[PDB]
């Protein structure tokens, strides 16, 4: 049965090579219909919104609530127009970021009230969630070391708050598996392959 697998983590955790290993592992397990997505983005409108979030806004203060609304608008478009239909056709979906990123960056980083984050999540997504999330955990500075956009230019305390939120969620959500991304690409890759293989072997 079709599943939604998400790859998560701070800047430079290694989500790009992780997606590679996840797709390859799925293929090795006989899954031959897979759709990758990335957030924010993945549709014409969502990509326009991604640009609005990543670009600088000279002469205009981009309010925290506005940022949240934009990433959610992009997510709704992707979920309704790409992800759900793909799952419905029987394709597995592998996402480069999903809602956990809003929780970490907008909730932890921007410090938006938890009541606000949950009511917006409910409004946008209902109970829709990934089946497995592979959270690549990394010290923010180390990840940054690996033309910065508006968010990447935030001070490190923002990313520390984001990491704190990611870790809380990884610890409370049984569907989140944490990977130590501070290792060599080879070891991280090996741990991802194992965690996913281990998880696939327990479905049903």
Ligand X SMILES: Nc1ncnc2c1ncn2[C@@H]1O[C@H](COP(=O)(O)OP(=O)(O)O)[C@@H](O)[C@H]1O
Ligand Y SMILES: Cc1cn([C@H]2C[C@H](O)[C@@H](COP(=O)(O)OP(=O)(O)O)O2)c(=O)[nH]c1=O
- CA atoms of 120 and 68, how far apart (whole Å): 9
**DSSP bridge partners of 136:** 9, 179
Closer to ligand Y by Cβ: residue 26 or 40: 40
| Angle in degrees, CA 176, 182, 183, rounded to 5 | 105
Closer to Cl ion by Cβ: residue 15 or 110: 110
126 labelled ligand-binding: no
Report residue 152 as tokens: 């990447």
DSSP code of 26?
A: H
Contact residues for ligand Y (CB under 6 A)? 11, 39-40, 71, 97, 101-102, 105-106, 151
Q: How far is the CB of 95 from Ca ion (least distance, A)?
A: 12
Question: Residue 97 binds which one of ligand Y, Ca ion, Cl ion, none, with CB within 5 to 8 A depending on kind?
Answer: ligand Y
Considering only 6, 8, 12, 178, the residue that binds ligand X (CB under 6 A) is 12
30 labelled ligand-binding: no
170 labelled ligand-binding: no
Contact residues for a copy of itself (CB under 8 A)? 43-45, 48, 52, 57, 59-63, 65-66, 69-70, 72-73, 76-77, 80-81, 116, 119-120, 123-124
146 binds ligand X (CB under 6 A): yes
Q: Which of 98, 96, 109 is nearest to 164 (CA)?
A: 109
Three-state DSSP at 35 gives: strand
16 labelled ligand-binding: yes
Q: How far is the CB of 113 from Ca ion (least distance, A)?
A: 22
CB 11 within 8 A of CB 140: yes
Report residue 60 as tokens: 């205009």
11 labelled ligand-binding: yes
Report residue 40 as tokens: 């924010």
**DSSP bridge partners of 3:** none
Annotated binding site: 9-16
């Amino acid at each position: 049965n079709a599943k939604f697998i998400v790859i998560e983590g701070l800047e430079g955790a290694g989500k790009s090579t992780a997606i590679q290993v996840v797709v390859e592992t799925l293929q090795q397990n006989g899954i031959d219909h897979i759709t990758r997505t990335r957030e924010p983005g993945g549709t014409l409108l969502a990509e326009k919104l991604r640009a609005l979030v990543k670009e600088e806004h000279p002469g205009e203060e981009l309010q925290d609530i506005t940022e949240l609304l934009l990433v959610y608008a992009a997510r709704v478009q992707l979920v309704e127009n790409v992800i759900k239909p793909a799952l419905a056709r029987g394709e597995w979906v592998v996402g480069d970021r999903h809602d956990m990123s809003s929780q970490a960056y907008q909730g932890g980083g921007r410090q938006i009230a938890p009541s606000t984050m949950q009511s917006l999540k409910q409004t946008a997504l209902g109970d829709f969630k990934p089946d497995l999330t592979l959270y690549l955990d990394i010290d923010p500075k180390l990840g940054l070391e690996r033309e910065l956009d508006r968010i990447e230019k935030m001070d490190i305390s923002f990313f520390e708050r984001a990491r704190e939120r990611y870790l809380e969620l990884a610890n409370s959500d049984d569907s989140v598996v944490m990977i130590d991304a501070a290792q060599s690409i080879e070891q991280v890759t090996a741990d991802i392959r194992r965690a996913l293989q281990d998880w696939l072997s327990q479905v049903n």
